[PDB]
Design a protein around this ligand. Structure first.
Ligand SMILES: [K+]
Ligand SMILES: [K+]
Ligand SMILES: [K+]
Ligand SMILES: [K+]
Ligand SMILES: [K+]
Ligand SMILES: [K+]
Ligand SMILES: [K+]
Ligand SMILES: [K+]
Ligand SMILES: [Mg+2]
Ligand SMILES: [Mg+2]
Ligand SMILES: [Mg+2]
Ligand SMILES: [Mg+2]
Ligand SMILES: [Mg+2]
Ligand SMILES: [Mg+2]
Ligand SMILES: [Mg+2]
Ligand SMILES: [Mg+2]
Ligand SMILES: [Mg+2]
Ligand SMILES: [Mg+2]
Ligand SMILES: [Mg+2]
Ligand SMILES: [Mg+2]
Ligand code: NA
Ligand code: NA
Ligand code: NA
Ligand code: NA
Lengths: 105, 101, 212, 56, 71, 100
RNA sequence: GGAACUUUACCAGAUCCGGACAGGAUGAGAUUGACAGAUUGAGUGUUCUUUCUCGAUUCCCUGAAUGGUGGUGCAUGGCCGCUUAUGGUCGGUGGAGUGAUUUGUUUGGUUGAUUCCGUCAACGGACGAGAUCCAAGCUGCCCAGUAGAAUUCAGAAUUGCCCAUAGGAUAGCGCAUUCGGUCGAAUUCUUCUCUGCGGGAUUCCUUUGUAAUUGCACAAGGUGAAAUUUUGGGCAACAGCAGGUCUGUGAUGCUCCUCAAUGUUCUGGGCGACACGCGCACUACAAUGUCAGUGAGAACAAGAAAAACGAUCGAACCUACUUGAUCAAAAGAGUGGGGAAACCCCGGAAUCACAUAGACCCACUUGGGACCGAGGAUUGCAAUUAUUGGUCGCGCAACGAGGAAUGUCUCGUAGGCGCAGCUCAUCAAACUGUGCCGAUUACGUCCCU
């Protein structure tokens, strides 16, 4: 075995006692600002969804959340409602993803 | 009364040098035969280390043992069947007599 | 319950391995050259191959009955259900097990290593062998151990064909200074009948029919 | 007395102490597959006599 | 890498010397002739011999070839 | 598991040894050895019969072979004569191996 | 080499002789074994008190002998690993040197190749390479009551007008589909499956290609299931290494201990012990996601016992079905089947899919489960130092993609995903195989090693 030369038991003991914590953090990280997204609709936010969200060429739950500062869970819920009232039309659909667009005229 | 003839051996050459003989002797006995079925060949696998001490590159030894099985079903009485089977087989081949109902 | 067909052959193989080992130690002084058995409904018919047939039978079949008693008691054979025969080796010089036992007996009789190993090689090739190799290793020339190999003739060492054309055997010779290992490999000539030969042409040889 | 105390754990017959090698009575690295009960080192020397062949 | 080893080349030169009249310019009919005029454990070598015998025959039709003696 | 063999069990083992010139016993300290002795059958511990054959071998009365956890003991000419003297069997009595 | 006891080799203690045999002193009383009390960790005759039993097997002492997972692998055998995955190695006779030595075995092209062609003071050989062998893909004969299929009779089911809570895209335009419990019959057959010998592929065919100025070959395309060692393995020369193993063996020389033993058993502990450093894995850091549903769907494989025990079978082994269930899981039971192409099994694996109109919505968060608490069941002679599942809690334990460095890999491959075997009474973050989903890049070079 590579038994270190001139290494003491006191040298050993002082090595492990100083080996706790210290060296770490090999990544920069670059922290981000928190996203304050509302979990329920306000009166003015719900008014924007019924009026401003239509006549958008591309409509997506993640897009609407980025506009109205709301959660995607309720952003998707409002979009499903706007389809029930035929204000927007659904172009691509799956379990995980829905794409909507404005109606013609 | 159907009699079942089961042949099994380690040797591929010997396992069917008795089925061919059993097939021939029964054809000389004019007894109706359901052809010899080649049952799947089962391989017994043992994989061990080559070394006796656990030193060096861990190399392994794959040992295989194949079993060959055949069956012949013939409509013949016990006395007639015993005539067909009453001959010298080779070493390492065992033939089993079975009556089906 | 009947043992599974995969368990019956394992039992048959393990039985033959023990039977081979028992005869190797018992019949070392003779040229024990293998054992075969043929289990029938009436008996078992164990056949022993050795160079000195008279030495394994004894007087009036004394020793072969002692061996029969050994096998009967070991494997619990009912009386009359086990029979033992002994047959002679057709060519004594084409059996690696017989030649390795002869070499081991020569060394234990204080024969010189080069003289004994050379003497085996000439006898092997006087019998029609295509080749022969004899290896002796251990404490031959002093405290340091050396391995000396003696060759003569052809010998293939690679592929799988060398397991059907080459007969090999090794033994341990316990001498005063220590154990000495002897190896004998004999390259068998081909035979039309295959009685003492591989009975197949060499995997690389290609003969052309002479036009008639 | 001492006769009953003698080899009491061995007569229990469980564990690696119970199982040994059918060729050399060694308790290390035993091949129990197919009920061989042969050492891995003793197997490699007796594999051909049992019927096992070394291919691929 | 598809070189004919000296075992194939020597055997295919022996076949041309002994059965030149029976041979031809095609592999498949020549391979049939190689099948019964040769003893070999391997079908692959018989296939490589038949390939090189045909190569010799195409070489012979253009001129003499070293290593082939036809009386 | 004791090596204090009884005299009747030693005599029974010696009777089987003379009748069948060979005794084959497994090399294990537990377990038992089974013999027939013509009619019926008898059983003696393996360690005890191994103990008896240690004495005979040290007296050059038997030859010993061992292979795969199993002993093989065979009486020799001096050993057979001793068994006749010990068992008090009349002359011309021989084991089944000797008997034609 | 996944150690609860055993294993086990270590530690604290207690038994046995498994000191054969030979020579002496006792001796038909040599000895063996023991209930009760106490000695003790031990309702351990170990020893002791007290006697009974045994019987010539044994004790006493002298030599000896045996056993040992004792030493020494730098005394060895055998086996293995490595030099060393490449193309290497060696005689005979002849030539050349005073000789070690050299030639052969060389240069040119080619090839993975000392593979070939050519040249030639070398000519003849031998081994390795190649060939052989084993598995994959294509196919022939054989073949089935241990594999299946298609028809024909019957018996049952849907049956046409129907447009989803928003309902798009995607084949049908003489007889309409289903129904491995409808456990229904009859007939026919080998398309799938099983497999012992075969066939098949080799530079075979073609370039106004490279090369050729003979050749050996090469590159693209063709034929084809397969197009270059077909693919993947196994085997693998000669010289070695003071490489590993005396912990595989009744493989072993020398030496060590040998009756309060380094033998052998039994009890308990340890091999797991934690300021720390390192190798190899497992799980992650989330939305190309986590949960809760639903669908369709592999392959390799393993399955039970004796000269024991009960009345030649029957129980151990693996399972399916039912029950438990008039209410959690894990269990526990009963019945039947399977010696294994027969039962498991129509092998309902997980990646995967879902137009599931499902929840979450960027946060150390429904990510991540480390750590710990209480109940309960199972394996075992024994669970404390949690053996292993299952239930509810903890989750405020780090971890948000990892510095310098560094491993493996060319196509059904990497990566991902499970499954079986093996160790196994109980326990896989292991290995050995197996199939499933399946790419990026290169078709080179000698810059680094
Ligand atoms: K088992
Ligand atoms: K032990
Ligand atoms: K060695
Ligand atoms: K090399
Ligand atoms: K000279
Ligand atoms: K090249
Ligand atoms: K190798
Ligand atoms: K070597
Ligand atoms: Mg070769
Ligand atoms: Mg090769
Ligand atoms: Mg454990
Ligand atoms: Mg010990
Ligand atoms: Mg030992
Ligand atoms: Mg060494
Ligand atoms: Mg040279
Ligand atoms: Mg070299
Ligand atoms: Mg212990
Ligand atoms: Mg450890
Ligand atoms: Mg718990
Ligand atoms: Mg492991
Ligand atoms: Na010379
Ligand atoms: Na020379
Ligand atoms: Na030693
Ligand atoms: Na380089």
């Amino acid at each position: 075995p590579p038994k270190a030369g001139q290494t003491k038991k006191a040298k050993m003991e002082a090595a492990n006692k100083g080996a706790k914590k210290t060296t770490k953090k090999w990544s920069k990280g670059q922290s981000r600002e928190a996203l304050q997204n509302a979990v329920m609709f306000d009166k003015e936010t719900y008014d924007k969804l019924r009026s401003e969200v239509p006549k958008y060429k591309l409509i997506t739950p993640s897009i609407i959340s980025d506009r109205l500062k709301i959660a995607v869970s309720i952003a998707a819920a409002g979009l499903k409602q706007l389809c029930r009232e035929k204000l927007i039309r659904l172009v691509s659909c799956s379990s995980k993803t829905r794409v909507y667009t404005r109606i013609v005229q | 009364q159907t009699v079942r003839l089961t042949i099994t051996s380690r040797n591929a050459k010997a396992v069917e040098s008795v089925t061919s003989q059993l097939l021939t002797r029964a054809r000389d006995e004019k007894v109706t035969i359901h052809g010899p079925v080649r049952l799947p060949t089962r391989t017994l696998k043992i994989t061990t280390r080559k070394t006796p001490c656990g030193n060096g590159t861990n190399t392994w030894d794959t040992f295989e043992l194949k079993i060959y099985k055949r069956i012949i079903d013939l409509h013949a009485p016990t006395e007639q069947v015993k005539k067909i089977t009453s001959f010298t087989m080779e070493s390492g081949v065992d033939v089993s007599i079975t009556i089906l109902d | 319950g009947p043992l599974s067909k995969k368990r019956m052959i394992i039992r048959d193989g393990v039985f033959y391995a023990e039977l081979f080992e028992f005869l190797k130690r018992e019949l070392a002084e003779e040229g024990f050259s293998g054992v075969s058995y043929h289990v029938t409904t009436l008996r078992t018919e164990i056949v022993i191959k050795a160079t000195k047939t008279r030495e394994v039978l004894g007087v009036n079949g004394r020793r072969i009955r002692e061996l029969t008693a050994c096998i009967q008691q070991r494997f619990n054979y009912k009386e009359g259900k086990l029979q033992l025969y002994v047959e002679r080796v057709e060519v004594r010089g084409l059996s690696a097990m017989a030649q390795v036992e002869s070499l081991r007996f020569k060394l234990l009789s204080n024969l010189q290593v080069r003289r004994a190993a050379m003497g085996i090689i000439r006898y092997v090739m006087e019998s029609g062998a295509k080749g022969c190799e004899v290896t002796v290793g251990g404490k031959i020339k002093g405290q340091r151990a050396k391995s000396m190999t003696f060759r003569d003739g052809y010998m293939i060492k690679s592929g799988t064909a060398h397991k059907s054309f080459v007969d090999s055997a090794c033994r341990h010779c316990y001498m005063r200074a220590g154990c000495i290992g002897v190896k004998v490999k004999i390259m068998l000539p081909g035979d039309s009948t295959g009685r003492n030969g591989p009975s197949e042409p060499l995997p690389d040889v290609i003969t052309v029919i002479e036009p008639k | 007395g001492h006769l009953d105390q003698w080899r009491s754990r061995q007569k229990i017959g469980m564990g690696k102490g119970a199982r040994c090698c059918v060729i050399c009575s060694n308790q290390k690295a035993l091949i129990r597959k197919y009920e061989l009960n042969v050492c891995r080192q003793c197997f490699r020397e007796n594999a051909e006599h049992i019927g096992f062949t070394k291919l691929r | 890498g598809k070189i004919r080893t000296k075992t194939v080349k020597r055997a295919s030169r022996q076949v041309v010397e002994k059965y030149y009249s029976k041979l031809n310019f095609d592999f498949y009919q020549n391979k049939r002739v190689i099948m019964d005029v040769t003893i070999a454990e391997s079908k692959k070598l018989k296939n490589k011999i038949a390939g090189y015998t045909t190569h010799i025959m195409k070489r012979l039709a253009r001129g003499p070839v070293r290593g082939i003696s036809l009386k | 598991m004791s090596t204090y063999v009884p005299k009747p069990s030693r005599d029974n083992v010696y009777r089987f040894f003379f009748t069948e010139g060979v005794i084959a016993c497994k090399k294990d300290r537990m377990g038992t050895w089974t013999g027939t002795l013509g009619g019926n059958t008898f059983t003696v511990p393996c360690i005890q019969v191994m103990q008896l054959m240690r004495s005979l071998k040290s007296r050059n009365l038997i030859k010993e072979q061992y292979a795969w956890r199993h002993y093989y003991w065979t009486l020799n000419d001096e050993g057979i004569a001793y068994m006749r003297s010990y068992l008090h069997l009349a002359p011309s009595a021989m084991p089944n191996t000797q008997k034609p």
